[PDB]
Structures are given as structure tokens and as C-alpha cells.
Design a protein around this ligand. Structure first.
Ligand SMILES: OC[C@H]1O[C@H](OC[C@H]2O[C@H](OC[C@H]3O[C@H](O)[C@H](O)[C@@H](O)[C@@H]3O)[C@H](O)[C@@H](O)[C@@H]2O)[C@H](O)[C@@H](O)[C@@H]1O
Ligand SMILES: OC[C@H]1O[C@H](OC[C@H]2O[C@H](O)[C@H](O)[C@@H](O)[C@@H]2O)[C@H](O)[C@@H](O)[C@@H]1O
Ligand SMILES: OC[C@H]1O[C@H](O)[C@H](O)[C@@H](O)[C@@H]1O
Ligand SMILES: OC[C@H]1O[C@H](O)[C@H](O)[C@@H](O)[C@@H]1O
Ligand SMILES: [Ca+2]
Lengths: 1275, 153
């Protein structure tokens, strides 16, 4: 049956009905939105029953009513059926009750013992499959498994003694047999389970008290050490050495030819002196064509992996890989293979390589082969990087923090800076040990904003933005007026003070409200305690108010059916006991509630100035738009890379869902009109409006308005005319739960300029402006709302509006929301003597001229609303009526603060005028900033006083040096950039090079156009990170989570890593970097003398940043290169280097010296030499068979002696490995198993050999053990 | 393009890593490629349970704090609906996510949940001080007043 959509589900008399988009009730079989369902003749849906349609017998599920497989007893007998209603043949089916039948070729269920798909199974007399139990068949007892139902060995307790049963149902005698859990036992000739130490078939096994065979178990059993095999549990004495590689010399006739020509940067490809897996070098000679050795020329570079390897495992893998590509006899080599054999095989590959170099006359084929091979190895890819996705790691897969390490990586030293997570609440580090430490790491290369030199540079950039027009076009009218601070909680909070004080110094923002409000500035500050901090610091930038944005989510914007009541908007707890009659403010509360109370806001109590919104470029947009693409198979993951075409296709589904006449929204937000009605009438806030609520978020800029555009436009124009004075807010509701009459309908009122209260009848200054001002808003979140016939709903418009005529601006109904542009076209209604507009279930309104209108207070459901919305305004409003307040030039306040929440500030409106998902301009004429210039007018008339423009910085684009790309970058939205000062300049060749939003001229014209129309322009200040830096450096790095704390179980600690941290040095950062600071220090000395809190220091302009590098960074997202891409000798743990001829370290082969490698015994003990020819000291070493050893400071393998404790405490150069290990007599480290000490105490040792303490531990067979704090096992 | 099982019984699918859906069944494989079976694993933002033998995604319940919670096949927590656990018990979870108990009327029909919160099917009882038989199919209360025989004399 063909699918349908857009018809809602209705419940009648306990049953589900489905009513079409046509609006007709549905009968019969129907595919609705990919689900196959049935309705009988009355139109009710069937669940948990079988129906017959066509030739099909189809069951429908008991919960969902969806077509799925079942078994029906048909006449006398069972018959299986599929999802489409076909009788099944030769298949298993599970019925409703979770029971399983197998129906044969004739579709009849099998009974008794059966062998299916090579599995033995049993069926009872009714055809049901036995699972999880014993069963006597053919005079034998067989156990059948819990879920498969397959025959398996098991044990049961007969009398008081355990007995064993095999897979064929025979009892076990003289053999090992398992149980379902996974424990092995041994049973003797008399059938009885054995215990303790037992020798069978010339081998010795250890069975514990429970009779469990113990594998990978070390202990003194015969008063002589004995290790029990991991494979079979058979006791070995652990006396024979298991390493297979004796000390051998590697040098031969090819050594001097393959040795390096030189020990320096000429002959070695490198980064900061160090070497990498894919380094190529210059050998002394070249085996050209595989025939004749000839001296090398400078260009004759060859891969290091042709000649050297870090270990035998890697060498064997290299040989196998290159073999497979036509270069030799294809080989299975292991680390266990002898060193001599591997080296010989490397040379035959070398020969073959030189032959294909002659044949192809190229080496690029080899570059690609080496690159490919290198990524295969775990040490050289992300597998050793501990990719994780929890927290902000979700974005890019994990972070590395750079470290101050002057001995190995001194260019990368931070000069003891790099304070992490100094967010506002942790500006002084006093919460460094808690979750109150800031998540310093977010995206890409995280800039160290705790460094005074970097702080100065951020100020330079800030100055450049605030004077962009003066500097780049000598146009003093093309300058940004204010800023948005991106990612406040992910940077050092000093930047807020730096920005604050700069604006104070240059614009006197702390002098007057007129100065302050000429340079509107906002914060992206998500932490719930940021508002109070920002206010203690004098409100230099406006905090967001998440408390109101949050409540829109809960009560209107999010969720089709279950929403928090409108009651929650009041925050009655603000008052003591919620006494709305008494109104005593609660001086002490448990850190809760909305930022600004609006129940009865007369402007008498000081409140924190703020901006607020319903949506943003980065709130309720990016996730929905992606969920939609995922839902339609366009991408698989949220982090997935997508193309612009992929985005366009997804956008079409998004738009379709947004504008759905059904009224249901899967990705999009509900009740946006109603949300904006509240946002735009609220006192004590600067509202912000999202481009994407006015125009479609994709495609071209301003290409097509949204369905919400008319309503929001009307609200915006009405805000200019009517919105002023005090506020009240109430609900027909007292809490979570609604009494009988209660509607939970919210009533919000504003009184008019100068009227602060319900009962205030006139202004104190006797101005008359108030009479035609004020506004009434009624909103509900219940689309199925029906009033009682008794019920009346009232708007207390106030005693300053007695007997006045009011007319509707906006009214909801069942097909949309009507908008009335002027008094004549709308229904009127008059207030009573007390100033109340009364509403009933049924209303008859009259138009001012003549005509009568009917209107029901009715919840509605359509694309524009799920609930109720009514807005009313006073008739008689002038055409040029303006209820806003101009800002005063006087020093109102001695509080030191910049912004003040008052009628003047409230007169502003910010427009966030871009969407992250805009398409790229198809032509220069449709570039965002060109369009903004032609359309500036339109925003003046909507009352926008400040225009928040997208970040104008040049996108880093598709560039990706390693690790996961982020959407900001590949969607070119401007948040991901390489050059902070390139805002759309031309290529140096003269050609245009626009951003996604147009050229730099387009931007200056756009900014000027906004000033010509009396609007400010906001610059997006993005100090937290920078993307895609083209130059490599070697850093010392630790793997960390978002707060810069080391991951708990990571070996990636203080390792050398190649990062991309260095800027081109020839970009606009190099031209403009630090240039404006000198002029500024001269003119405003105190900015440069004032100490910052987090550092104790003032900003430092003595050093200019023309080129970025790692010393100014805190870290990076993981780049997928590997923990040991920077090459290191395992024996000494020293990294190879060739930077300075005084302190060269290379493998001895490359210096034409003799490299001996292997294990060698002497009278004192065993020693080891690495492939590069160095002795192992104070390091762990792994042999070719996978066994691990520890070599002490003296260079000797640690091994247990007779009668002594095998447990040894290790403290190594490599700190991560510190801990207690268990070394056997032949030096092998015990791993993932229990070990007995000399005194009979048992301990456990983990995957990596370390002792485990103070925890419970589980076993594959479901055995549980407990380890005390001292390490011992109580069990 | 096949599953293989080790000596132990660990299972790979050739190997796929992470969240994948081989033959329409949702499975999770660890970073080393082993198939997750009989446990809750966290992928993305949604917790999912994978079945003991098959390893297929299924609804399950776990105890968070001291309260039972329900998880569906897609890894989303269940609110205002019936959801199963691996054993085969059905529960009902309210708008606040919490399991319901006792006699409950939802969507104009009445169901009986025992103390443990198990939905009882094919269960006869005087529940409202009046007889009520709870359906073998969905557990919905009928009065058992209509004759079910279909053949008149
Ligand atoms: O933030 C403004 C809001 O603050 C209080 O209400 C908070 C919250 O209260 C309801 O839900 C309770 C809520 O508590 C925690 O946040 C849990 O973690 C949530 O799961 C749980 O739902 C209400 O339903 C929410 O919408 C509301 O935000 C004030 O009491 C409110 O008046 C005020 O608007
Ligand atoms: O091929 C797998 C499996 O198919 C059937 O089992 C399916 C199903 O049966 C129950 O519902 C169990 O509780 C689940 O764990 C199972 O996946 C056959 O019965 C079985 O023999 C076969 O192995
Ligand atoms: O035992 C064999 C069975 O394994 C399981 C499969 O899901 C089923 O289809 C198959 O026949
Ligand atoms: O059917 C073959 C089966 O092999 C395995 O046991 C896999 O775990 C399972 O997913 C698969 O279906
Ligand atoms: Ca940061």
C-alpha cells in the first residue's frame, strides 16, 4: 500500500483513528510514513491481532500496530508468517510471547530433535523451541543454549555433586568439559569433578576450590614457581627464555651504501630537527636500477623505511605490504621472524624498488606507497590517539594540550603561560580541580589567551575591527560599532576586561547611556553563573538571558505534545511563598529562577541588563538541519562532512517540515510567532531576532521569506509604536497541574510610556503619550484547548486605559494567524471602567466601521501555531507614533557600570542577520553584504538599532591538515578562518577574492549603508581559535578532555607530536599584526599599565605577533598522526634528531656503524639491544612473540628469583607505566591475570601488566573478585 | 562481507568499527572491531542496548539512581509509553520517565500493572470492585460481558 503523510492521529473511545490530509477517516490497509497498518470498517486501528487483506495473513504489533512476523494457530496447526503476510517456509519465527518455531519446506513446524544450519536443536510436541534448559532426547540428556537454542556442554548438580554433560547429551568421564557461563572443569573416571593441582596426560593443571580451570595464572604450586598457560591452562616452569632473537650484527656490504650522506637537514627531511615515519633521506649511494651503486645527487632522496625500522613488527609489516604491491615474493613475516631474514628480504625489496624507479622514471608512486603504509600502523595513526566523543570532544574527536618542555621542544615553550579554563567563574583558577574549570578546548587550534603578548594582539585585532573602515578604505563611516564575543566560556576571561576598558577609553562608554548604547556589545556566555559575574564587573557587554530562552523551549518551542506550563514563565518563587497578593521579594533563594521578574515590573528594582532570543545561528538550527539530512539518508553522522548539494537537498525537507500544514514539526520549532510576541514585548531586555525566522536558512541571502515573516514584521513595527512602560504578566494557572476551569493561558501587558503599574492612572510629568500606547498579549501552548462556557479571560490593560477602544494586531485561528496592519481592518473591543478587556469562549467583535466579526477563544493547530495567540493594541495610534526612549547624555550613575537596564536600552533591537547554512553566492550581485546595502531601509523600519553581521574572516574552507574537519570550515560561514585580518581582500594578482559574504568593499558599503539608516554594525570577535595553519612544528603533547585534564587511561602523555601551528608569515596577519598597539600605548597609557586578574600582569605590546606558532597555543584537536610518528628509539627512549651537529642522535646503521640487536645473556642477567643498536635501560621492551619485559637502570631484565617476591615496583622515565608488575623467572610480565606472591597472597594484573587495587573485577565466565586497597584479593 | 567468531566467541564483521547496521540490524563494534553483545553501549548522545546472542539493538530497562528507566531500540529514553525489557516484561513510563504501578487508565483504556510494574496480560481480576479481564494481546481491560461465540442456533 502506497504511503501517505500530513494526516493526524485521533483517539476515540480508547481507539486510534487516522484522519487524512483530505480530512477523511481512513479504513483498510495503509502505509502511513513507512509503517504498514490496518483499520477495520469503523476506522479504528488494529493492534496485536491478525487481519486478512488480499491473499495475505498479516499480524500487526500490540504497541505500535505495525505489520510484523508472527505465528498463528490456523485451524489445528501452527503456521509462520512474515511482515508482508506470506506463509513462511524454511525459516525461524518468533511469536508474540517470544517463543520460537522452525517451519520446514512445507511450512509445517518441526518437532523433536533437529539439526538446522549445522546446529542441533529440540522442539516440544507443540513445535516450540527449547532454549536455556536440559532435555532428555534419545535416552540422553542435552542442554540447549539460552538464545540460540544450540546444543552445548553444561554442568548440573546431581545429588550434591556437580556433573558434566557434553553437547551430544552424554555425561563426561575422564575429560575437561565446560559450562554455559564459560568455566572449564575436569571430571574423572567416576564422573566426579576434580579439585586442586592435577597432572593429566603428562601435563599439570591447577583447578581452584570451585573446580574452575585457571588459565594465565602464576603461582607457587609445587613450592616451585609455575605459570599456567593462557591457552590450555597447562603448567610451564617459566624457566626457558621465550625470546627468539639472539644478539646479531646487522652491518654488511650494503651498510656503507645505504648510510646517510650527511647527519643534518640536507640529507634528512625533518621538522624542527626531528624525524618522522615518512621521512625520506639521502643515502651515500644509490643502487640504480638494482645493478650498480652510484653516488647520490642531492635530489636522490629515498624513504627511511626502505632501510630502517623502529622494531621488527613494523619491519615485517613493511615487507609484507610492499611484497603485495608487486615488489617481491609475497611474504608472511612476523616479528618472530629472524632479524637476518627480515634484513635480507628488505634488500630484495630495495632492489625491486630501484627497478620500478628506473621503469617509471619517478618516485611519486613510492611517496604514495609509503604514505599508505605508514597510516596502516597504529603508532602512526589515530588508534594511538584515543579518539573520544564525549563532551566538546564530540566535535572533532579529542584534544591535545601542549606542554612547556624547554629540553626537547624549546620553540614551543609558553614562557610559563598556558593557564587553562580561566572562564569567568574560574578567572583566578580557584575551581581548577572541579567541573567549574572552563572547557578551554573547543575547536581547531586553541589560542593561549592567558599570555599577555597574545592578549595585546587580540586588542590590536579588536582595534582593527572597530576602525576597519578608517584603516582599509580611509572611510570613517565604514567602521564597526560594537562586538559579539564568541565562546566566552572557552577563553580567558581577561579578554572581557580588555575589551571593556578599550571601549571605555576610546568611546567613554562608562560616561553616559548615550555613549554606551552607541556601541552595543553582546556576549555568547552560556554558563548559568555568568550573568552575576558580568554584572559585578560593570556590564561592559550584555549577558545573554538563557533563563527565558530555556523556558521558551520547555513551554512553547519544543515538543509536539508535552510542555511545561506557561505558569513557569512567571517564576512566582521570586516572591516569598509565591504570594501574588502580598509581593514580598524573597531575599534568599537556592540559586534558581528567571533573571528578570515580570509579574509586576514597575521599574523600581535594579536588574541585570541583557539580550534575549528565541533562536540563533547556533541555537535550534544546526542540529535540526542535520537531523533532517540524517533522517533522509543524506549523511550518516552529525560530524559527517557534507557537500553544498547535500545541504540543498536536506534543506528542501527542512523547509517542507517547517511549512507543514498538518502543524506537526519533526525538526523545526513550534510556536515561533507566539514566542516572538513575548520576546518583543518584554521589559528590561534587548531582544534579538534571527534571520532564519524571517527568511529561509538555506539558499541565497534573503531569497525567500518564511511563513512567520508577516507576523514577526508586524510585531516589530508595533513594538516601535506601542511598547513602553511597566509590565505585568499572569496565567490562568497556579502550578504544574490545572484545576477544572483553568486554561493555563498567559496574559502579558505593557502600559505605555510613563505608566508603571496596573492602578497608576496618569504620568508624573503629565505627558499624554501613554494613552495610545501599551499592548496586550495572550498566549497558550495547547492546540486542543477548549474553554468552559462559564469561563472569561481578562487582560488588565490598566487604570490608565479606562473605557478605551482596543483593536487586534494578531489573532490565531485554525488555518493560520491573521495580521491586521491598521485600525480599520481589525476587530475592536472596548475596555471597561477598570480598564480590563474581557474575553469569553464565544466573542462577537465589531469592526470600528460597521461590520461584525465572530471569534472563538480556541486552541488551534497549523504551520504557524500549536496553541493560542492574541495581541491587542489601542486604536487611534498616530502613523509616526514612537514609544521608544532616547538615551541621556548626563552621568546618570556613579556605579562605574556601562550598560543599565532601562527604557532607553530596551528601545534597541538586535538583528542577527545571517545563517550558517546559506548557500554560496551564485553571483556577485547576490552576496549577503551587497544585498544588505540595498535593503538597509527595510530594517530601519522594523526598529533594528544594531545589525549583527556574520563573521567576515576568510574561511579555511576544505583545507584539512589532519583530524576531523568541522562544518564552519567547509560551509565557509566565517567562524573557521586562517587569516584573522583578511575580510575579503583581493588576491595579490589583482583578482577579486570574496568571502562567502562578498569583498571588503562590499562590507564597507554594507556598514556605511547601515549608518546612513541609523543602525550600528556588530563585529563577531572570535579570539578562541584559528584553523588550518600551513606550517609544521614539533610540540610536546598530552591527551586531554575539554577542560585540559589528562584522560584517565591514556598513555599519550608528554609525547612529541607534529602539529600544524605555524602561520604563513606572509598573510594579512603579517601585514597588520601588532601595528596599532604603539599608537594606542602612546595615546592611552593606562590600558597597557592595568593588571589583568588571571595573570597578575598587564598586557604586553613589547612583542608583536606577525606569525602564529605553537608557543602561543594551548593545543589542538587530534590530527590522526599517531603517538609515535616522531621517531624514537625504544631502548633509550630518546628521539632522533639532526638539528645541531653537536647533539646528533641517529640509528647506528645510518651512520655506517654496527648496530647489534637482540637479547643476550651474561653472568649477571639478560640485556637487550634495539634495531638501532642501543642498549635498553629503564624501559619496557616487547619481543617478537608479544611478551613484555622490563629492563632496569643498569640495563638488566628484571626476573623473579626462587623463594622471593615476583612483584616489583617500577619507576620509569616513561611515568605512565609506573606501577607494580609481576615478572616471572624468565622475565615475562604477567598480564590480564592473577599472580601469587611468595606468601600465598593473590593479586591481579591488568591488560598492560599493572597491579589492580581497590575494586571489583569480573570474568568472562561471570566470576567476580574483589581486590583490597593493598592489592590483595579477598574475593 | 561476513561475520566470524573467535575461539572465545568474540565476533567481527568484515572489519567494521563503530556504529553500523549490517543486514538492517543495529550493532555496535568497539575500536578494536569486536561486536558488542549483552550490554548498554554509548554511541552519539543516545544509550543503546544490544542483545545477548544476536547483538541486535533492542528496548531495555536499567536502574538509574534508585528508579527503573526505559530505553528503546534507537537509544532514546522512553516517556509516555509502553516499553519492554530483554526478559520480555512490559512496563509503562509516564511523561517524567518514571515507571508506573497499579491500575492505570491511558488513552481511554485500562491496564493493570503489578507492584513490579509488569503489565499483566491474560489476567482476570475484580479491579474496580467490578470484574475485569485484561487482554492476552495488549493487556487492555474488557468487561468480559459480550459473548464471544459466533454461532447461533
Ligand atoms: O530557568 C527559568 C525557570 O527556572 C525555574 O524553573 C526551572 C524549570 O522548572 C520546570 O522543570 C523542572 C526541571 O528541573 C531541572 O531543570 C531538571 O533537570 C529538568 O528536567 C526539569 O524539567 C519547568 O518545567 C522548566 O521549564 C523550568 O525551566 C523557575 O521556577 C521557572 O519559573 C523559570 O521559568
Ligand atoms: O539465527 C539466530 C536465531 O534465530 C532464532 O532465535 C531468534 C530469537 O529468539 C528469541 O527471541 C531469543 O530470545 C533471541 O535471543 C533470539 O535472537 C532461533 O530460535 C535460534 O535457534 C537462532 O539461533
Ligand atoms: O543457526 C542458523 C541461524 O542463525 C541465526 C540467523 O539469524 C538465522 O537466519 C540462521 O538460519
Ligand atoms: O547469522 C550469523 C551471525 O553470526 C554472529 O553470531 C553474529 O553475531 C550475528 O550478528 C550474525 O547474524
Ligand atoms: Ca580556548
Amino acid at each position: 500500500s502506497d504511503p501517505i503523510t500530513g494526516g493526524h492521529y485521533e483517539n476515540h473511545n480508547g481507539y486510534f483513528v487516522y484522519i487524512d490530509a483530505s480530512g477523511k477517516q481512513v479504513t483498510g490497509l495503509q502505509n502511513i510514513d513507512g509503517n504498514l497498518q490496518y483499520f477495520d470498517d469503523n476506522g479504528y486501528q488494529v493492534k496485536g491481532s491478525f487481519r486478512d487483506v488480499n491473499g495475505k495473513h498479516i499480524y500487526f504489533d500490540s504497541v505500535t500496530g505495525k505489520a510484523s512476523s508472527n505465528v498463528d494457530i490456523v485451524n489445528g496447526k501452527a503456521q509462520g508468517y512474515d511482515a508482508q503476510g506470506n506463509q513462511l517456509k524454511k525459516s525461524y519465527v518468533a511469536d508474540s510471547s517470544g517463543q520460537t518455531y522452525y517451519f520446514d519446506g512445507n511450512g509445517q513446524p518441526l518437532i523433536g530433535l533437529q539439526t538446522i544450519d549445522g546446529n542441533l536443536q529440540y522442539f516440544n510436541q507443540q513445535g516450540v523451541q527449547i532454549k536455556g534448559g536440559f532435555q532428555d532426547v534419545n535416552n540422553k540428556r542435552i542442554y540447549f543454549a539460552p538464545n540460540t537454542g544450540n546444543a552445548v556442554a553444561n554442568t548440573e548438580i546431581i545429588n550434591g555433586k556437580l556433573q558434566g554433560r557434553d553437547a551430544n547429551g552424554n555425561q563426561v568421564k575422564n575429560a575437561f568439559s565446560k559450562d554455559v557461563a564459560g568455566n572449564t572443569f575436569y571430571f574423572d573416571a567416576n564422573g566426579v569433578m576434580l579439585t586442586g593441582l592435577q597432572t593429566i596426560s603428562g601435563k599439570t593443571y591447577y583447578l581452584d576450590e570451585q573446580g574452575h580451570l585457571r588459565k594465565n595464572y602464576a603461582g607457587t604450586f609445587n613450592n616451585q614457581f609455575m605459570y599456567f598457560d593462557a591457552d590450555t591452562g597447562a603448567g610451564k616452569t617459566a624457566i626457558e627464555y621465550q625470546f627468539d632473537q639472539g644478539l646479531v650484527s646487522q652491518s654488511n656490504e650494503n651498510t656503507p651504501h645505504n648510510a646517510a650522506k650527511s647527519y643534518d637537514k640536507s640529507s634528512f627531511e625533518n621538522v624542527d630537527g626531528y624525524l618522522t615515519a615518512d621521512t625520506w633521506y639521502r643515502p651515500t649511494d644509490i643502487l640504480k636500477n638494482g645493478d650498480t651503486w652510484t653516488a647520490s645527487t642531492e635530489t636522490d632522496m629515498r624513504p627511511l623505511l626502505m632501510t630502517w625500522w623502529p622494531d621488527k613488527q613494523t619491519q615485517a609489516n613493511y615487507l609484507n605490504f610492499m611484497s603485495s604491491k608487486g615488489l617481491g615474493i609475497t611474504t608472511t613475516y612476523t616479528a618472530a621472524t629472524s632479524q637476518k631474514t627480515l634484513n635480507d628480504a628488505a634488500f630484495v625489496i630495495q632492489t625491486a624498488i630501484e627497478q620500478q624507479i628506473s621503469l617509471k622514471k619517478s618516485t611519486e608512486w613510492l611517496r604514495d606507497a609509503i604514505d599508505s603504509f605508514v597510516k596502516t600502523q597504529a603508532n602512526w595513526n589515530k588508534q594511538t590517539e584515543d579518539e573520544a566523543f564525549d563532551g566538546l570532544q564530540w566535535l572533532q574527536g579529542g584534544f591535545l594540550a601542549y606542554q612547556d618542555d624547554s629540553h626537547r621542544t624549546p620553540n614551543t615553550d609558553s614562557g610559563n603561560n598556558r593557564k587553562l579554563g580561566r572562564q569567568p567563574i574560574n578567572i583566578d583558577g580557584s575551581k581548577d580541580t572541579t567541573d567549574g574549570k572552563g572547557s578551554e578546548f573547543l575547536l581547531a587550534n586553541d589560542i593561549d589567551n592567558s599570555n599577555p603578548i597574545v592578549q595585546a594582539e587580540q586588542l590590536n585585532w579588536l582595534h582593527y575591527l572597530m576602525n576597519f573602515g578608517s584603516i582599509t578604505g580611509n572611510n570613517d563611516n565604514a567602521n564597526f560599532d560594537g562586538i559579539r564575543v564568541d565562546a566566552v566560556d572557552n577563553v580567558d576571561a581577561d579578554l572581557l576586561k580588555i575589551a571593556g576598558d578599550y571601549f571605555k577609553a576610546l568611546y567613554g562608554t562608562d560616561k553616559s547611556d548615550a555613549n554606551a548604547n552607541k556601541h552595543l556589545s553582546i556576549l555568547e556566555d552560556w554558563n548559568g553563573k555568568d550573568p552575576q559575574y558580568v554584572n559585578q564587573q560593570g556590564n561592559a557587554q550584555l549577558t545573554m538571558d538563557y533563563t527565558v530562552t530555556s523556558q521558551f523551549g520547555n513551554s512553547l518551542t519544543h515538543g509536539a505534545n508535552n510542555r511545561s506550563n506557561m505558569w513557569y514563565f512567571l517564576d512566582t518563587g521570586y516572591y516569598l511563598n509565591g504570594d501574588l497578593n502580598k509581593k514580598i521579594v524573597d531575599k534568599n533563594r537556592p540559586n534558581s529562577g528567571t533573571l528578570v521578574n515580570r509579574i509586576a515590573n514597575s521599574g523600581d528594582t535594579k536588574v541585570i541588563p541583557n539580550y534575549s532570543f528565541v533562536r540563533a545561528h547556533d541555537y535550534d538550527a544546526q542540529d535540526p538541519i542535520r537531523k533532517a539530512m540524517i533522517d533522509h539518508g543524506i549523511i550518516k553522522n552529525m560530524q559527517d562532512t557534507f557537500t553544498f548539494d547535500q545541504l540543498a537537498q536536506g534543506m528542501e525537507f527542512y523547509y517542507k517540515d517547517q511549512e507543514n500544514p498538518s502543524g506537526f514539526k519533526k525538526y523545526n520549532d513550534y510556536n515561533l510567532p507566539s514566542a516572538y510576541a513575548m520576546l518583543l514585548t518584554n521589559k528590561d531586555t534587548v531582544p534579538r531576532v534571527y534571520y532564519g525566522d524571517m527568511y529561509l536558512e538555506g539558499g541565497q541571502y534573503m531569497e525567500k521569506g518564511t511563513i512567520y515573516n508577516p507576523v514577526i514584521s508586524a510585531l516589530l513595527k508595533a513594538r516601535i509604536k506601542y511598547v513602553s512602560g511597566g509590565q505585568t504578566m499572569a496565567t490562568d494557572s497556579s502550578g504544574k497541574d490545572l484545576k477544572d476551569g483553568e486554561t493555563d493561558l498567559l496574559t502579558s501587558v505593557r502600559f505605555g510610556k510613563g505608566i508603571m503599574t496596573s492602578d497608576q492612572t496618569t504620568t508624573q510629568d503629565n505627558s499624554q503619550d501613554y494613552k495610545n500606547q501599551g499592548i496586550g498579549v495572550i498566549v497558550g501552548n495547547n492546540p486542543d484547548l477548549k474553554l468552559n462556557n462559564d469561563k472569561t479571560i481578562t487582560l488588565h490593560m490598566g487604570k490608565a486605559h479606562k473605557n478605551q477602544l482596543y483593536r487586534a494586531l494578531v489573532l490565531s485561528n485554525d488555518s493560520g494567524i491573521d495580521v491586521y496592519d491598521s485600525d480599520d481592518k481589525a476587530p475592536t473591543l472596548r475596555t471597561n471602567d477598570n480598564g480590563d478587556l474581557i474575553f469569553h469562549k464565544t466573542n462577537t467583535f465589531v469592526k470600528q466601521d460597521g461590520t461584525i466579526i465572530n471569534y472563538e477563544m480556541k486552541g488551534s493547530l497549523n504551520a504557524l501555531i500549536s496553541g493560542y495567540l492574541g495581541v491587542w493594541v489601542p486604536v487611534g495610534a498616530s502613523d509616526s507614533q514612537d514609544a521608544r526612549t532616547v538615551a541621556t547624555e548626563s552621568s546618570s550613575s556613579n556605579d562605574g557600570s556601562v550598560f543599565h537596564s532601562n527604557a532607553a536600552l530596551d528601545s534597541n533591537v538586535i538583528y542577527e542577520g545571517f545563517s550558517n547554512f546559506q548557500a554560496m553566492p551564485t553571483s556577485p550581485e547576490q552576496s549577503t553584504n551587497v544585498v544588505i546595502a540595498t535593503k538597509a531601509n527595510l530594517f530601519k523600519e522594523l526598529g533594528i538599532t544594531s545589525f549583527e553581521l556574520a563573521p567576515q574572516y576568510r574561511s579555511s574552507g576544505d583545507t584539512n591538515y589532519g583530524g576531523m574537519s568541522f562544518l564552519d570550515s567547509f560551509l565557509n560561514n566565517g567562524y573557521a578562518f586562517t587569516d584573522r585580518y583578511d575580510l575579503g581582500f583581493n588576491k595579490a594578482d589583482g583578482n577579486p577574492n570574496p568571502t562567502k559574504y562578498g569583498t571588503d568593499q562590499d562590507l564597507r558599503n554594507a556598514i556605511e549603508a547601515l549608518h546612513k539608516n541609523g543602525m550600528q554594525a556588530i563585529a563577531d570577535w572570535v579570539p578562541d581559535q584559528i584553523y588550518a595553519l600551513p606550517g609544521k612544528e614539533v610540540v610536546t603533547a598530552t591527551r586531554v578532555d575539554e577542560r585540559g585534564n589528562q584522560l584517565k587511561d591514556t598513555d599519550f602523555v608528554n609525547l612529541l607530536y607534529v602539529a600544524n601551528t605555524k602561520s604563513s608569515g606572509v598573510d594579512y596577519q603579517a601585514k597588520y599584526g601588532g601595528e596599532f598597539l604603539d599608537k594606542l600605548r602612546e595615546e592611552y597609557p593606562s590600558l597597557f599599565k592595568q593588571n589583568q586578574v588571571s595573570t597578575g600582569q598587564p598586557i604586553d605590546a613589547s612583542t608583536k605577533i606577525k606569525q602564529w606558532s605553537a608557543k602561543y597555543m594551548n593545543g589542538t584537536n587530534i590530527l590522526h598522526r599517531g603517538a609515535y610518528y616522531v621517531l624514537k628509539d625504544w631502548a633509550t627512549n630518546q628521539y632522533f634528531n639532526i638539528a645541531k651537529t653537536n647533539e646528533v642522535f641517529l640509528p647506528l646503521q645510518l651512520q655506517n656503524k654496527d648496530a647489534q640487536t637482540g637479547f643476550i645473556s651474561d653472568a649477571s642477567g639478560v640485556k637487550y639491544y634495539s634495531i638501532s643498536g642501543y642498549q635498553a635501560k629503564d624501559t619496557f621492551i616487547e619481543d617478537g612473540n608479544g611478551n613484555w619485559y622490563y629492563f632496569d637502570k643498569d640495563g638488566y631484565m628484571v626476573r623473579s628469583q626462587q623463594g622471593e617476591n615476583p612483584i616489583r615496583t617500577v619507576e620509569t622515565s616513561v611515568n605512565t607505566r609506573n606501577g607494580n608488575y609481576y615478572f616471572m623467572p624468565n622475565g615475562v610480565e604477567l598480564r590480564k591475570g592473577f599472580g601469587t606472591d611468595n606468601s600465598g597472597n593473590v593479586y591481579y594484573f591488568d591488560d598492560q601488566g599493572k597491579m589492580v587495587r581497590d575494586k571489583y573485577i569480573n570474568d568472562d565466565a561471570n566470576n567476580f573478585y574483589h581486590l583490597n586497597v593493598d592489592g590483595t584479593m579477598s574475593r | 562481507k561476513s561475520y566470524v567468531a573467535d575461539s572465545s566467541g568474540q565476533t567481527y564483521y568484515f572489519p567494521l568499527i563503530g556504529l553500523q547496521t549490517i543486514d538492517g540490524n543495529l550493532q555496535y563494534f568497539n575500536q578494536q572491531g569486536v561486536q558488542i553483545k549483552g550490554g548498554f553501549q554509548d554511541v552519539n548522545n543516545k544509550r543503546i542496548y544490544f542483545a545477548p546472542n544476536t547483538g541486535n539493538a533492542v528496548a531495555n530497562t536499567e536502574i538509574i539512581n534508585g528508579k527503573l528507566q526505559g530505553r528503546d531500540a534507537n537509544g532514546n529514553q522512553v516517556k509516555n509509553a509502553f516499553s519492554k525489557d530483554v526478559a520480555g516484561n512490559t512496563f509503562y513510563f509516564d511523561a517524567n520517565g518514571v515507571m508506573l504501578t497499579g491500575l492505570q487508565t491511558i488513552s481511554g483504556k485500562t491496564y493493570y500493572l503489578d507492584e513490579q510494574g509488569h503489565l499483566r496480560k491474560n489476567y482476570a481480576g475484580t479491579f474496580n470492585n467490578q470484574f475485569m479481564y485484561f487482554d492476552a494481546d495488549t493487556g487492555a481491560g474488557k468487561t468480559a460481558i459480550e459473548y464471544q461465540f459466533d454461532q447461533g442456533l
